[PDB]
Design a binder for this molecule. Structure first.
Ligand SMILES: O=C1NC(=O)[C@@H]2CC=CC[C@H]12
Length: 209
């Protein structure tokens, strides 16, 4: 059972802008996704200060970067608070609507794509380097879901049958053919040290086989 939804017109417009605009500084996608992971990890850590049982699905708070040249995927895994089904369909899209509008206005005033995170829609910077994005997520109050979109105006949501995560979010970047440099270890290290050197959680860069 796969459910297909339409993006809001404004969100689809943002995705087309990111995909079509000529912009060479693509490497900032990693900074945005790492920052999204750090924000979700902050949330579950704060919630556990008043409720230790919220960590029953995993005490570790960390971020993993997993490149896979065989599948041509780059995966950003965090053990943060995760996302409910309403998040995937309604809540994050409500927030992204006003953030997109502010992002569009700033761009016409001289801002560039690298400041996308200041408007709360940094996730969509993933489409600078990815033709398809899959998001596996598990919230303490909901089931494990798989979100997916190759842009084009629609996204799908399904109950995930893969390996259970416990809690957190898994963002799988199906990279474009000419963006395979972000599967190389030295490139990922250089980007992490350049834009994410002070993240308050351990970032483990997996290496390939
Ligand atoms: O992680 C994510 N952030 C988003 O804005 C996008 C839509 C909602 C949930 C899945 C994606």
């Amino acid at each position: 059972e796969v459910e297909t939804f339409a993006f809001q017109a404004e969100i689809a417009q943002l995705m087309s802008l990111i995909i079509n605009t000529f912009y060479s500084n693509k490497e900032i996608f990693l900074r945005e996704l790492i920052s999204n992971s750090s924000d979700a990890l902050d949330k579950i850590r704060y919630e556990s200060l008043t409720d230790p049982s919220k960590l029953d699905s995993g005490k570790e708070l960390h971020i993993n970067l997993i490149p896979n040249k065989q599948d041509r995927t780059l995966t950003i895994v965090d053990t943060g608070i995760g996302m409910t089904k309403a998040d995937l369909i309604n809540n994050l899209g409500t927030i992204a609507k006003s953030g997109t509008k502010a992002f569009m206005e700033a761009l016409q005033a001289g801002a560039d794509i690298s400041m996308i995170g200041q408007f709360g829609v940094g996730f969509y910077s993933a489409y600078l380097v990815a033709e398809k994005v899959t998001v596996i997520t598990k919230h303490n109050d909901d089931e494990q879901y798989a979100w997916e979109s190759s842009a084009g105006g629609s996204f799908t949501v399904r109950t995930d049958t893969g390996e259970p995560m416990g809690r957190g979010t898994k963002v799988i970047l199906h990279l474009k053919e000419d963006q395979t440099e972000y599967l190389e270890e030295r490139r990922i290290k250089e980007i992490v040290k350049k834009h994410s050197q002070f993240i308050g959680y351990p970032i483990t860069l997996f290496v390939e086989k």
